[PDB]
Structures are given as C-alpha cells and as structure tokens.
From a paper:
To identify residues essential for the interaction of the SLPL and SLPH subunits, we analyzed H/L complex formation in an enzyme-linked immunosorbent assay (ELISA) with a panel of individual point mutants. Mutations of a single amino acid within LID (F274A) or HID (Y27A) in SlpACD630 were sufficient to destabilise the H/L complex. Loss of SLPL also resulted in partial degradation of SLPH: N-terminal sequencing revealed truncation of the HID, indicating that this region is unstable in the absence of the LID/HID interaction.
In C. difficile, the S-layer largely consists of a major S-layer protein, SlpA, which assembles into a paracrystalline array enveloping the cell. The major protein of the C. difficile S-layer, SlpA, is post-translationally cleaved into two S-layer proteins (SLPs): the high molecular weight (HMW) and low molecular weight (LMW), herein referred to as SLPH and SLPL, respectively.
Author numbering:
A (entry chain A): 245 to 313
B (entry chain B): 9 to 47
Write the structure that this text describes.
Amino acid sequence: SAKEESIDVDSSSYISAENLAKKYVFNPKEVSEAYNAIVALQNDGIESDLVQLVNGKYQVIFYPEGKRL
Amino acid sequence: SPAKITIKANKLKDLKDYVDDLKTYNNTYSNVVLEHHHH
C-alpha cells in the first residue's frame, strides 16, 4: 500500500504548510530544490521536471522521509 | 505507508509561497533536535 495526497492551494480546504510539516519529515534538499526550481521558472522562465504545469496548475511532488515524532 | 505529496496552484506565486512556508516549518522542526543538544 501507498498514499497519494493532493494539496490544492487554490481550493476551499487544504492542509496548512505548518500542519504538513507537523505530520511529515521532508528531506530539506528535496524541498530546497523544488523551491529554487519554482523561483527559476517564475523569474527566468527556466523549465524543470520539478515544477510542471499539469492539468491547469503548476505542481511539485514530495516524497516524505518519515512521519514526524 | 510510503507517501507521495502533490502540491498544486494555478499561480506560481501561490505555489512558491506554500513551499516557502513548508521549507521554513520543516527546517524549524528539524532544528528542535539540535536545540535539545544545545540546552
């Protein structure tokens, strides 16, 4: 078994960044690389597999390391 | 179970802001570990 979670930041109800971080431990390098990719696309038009327009929204994907204690 | 988290926004600015907040909190919670050693 595996869990897919969608967080639609444009929707009426989604998990807060604070609560997502409370729930999961993320590899900081993963998150940093995605953040930088978003900035590069926004500022300089640099395309990356990390940040894609899919079905009308830009998206990033994260694979949490663990459930936070 | 293994988890795959997809974060989506129509505007890059909104996606950026969510990820920026996530980055901040993820780092803060990880820093708590180091604080326990410092203190």
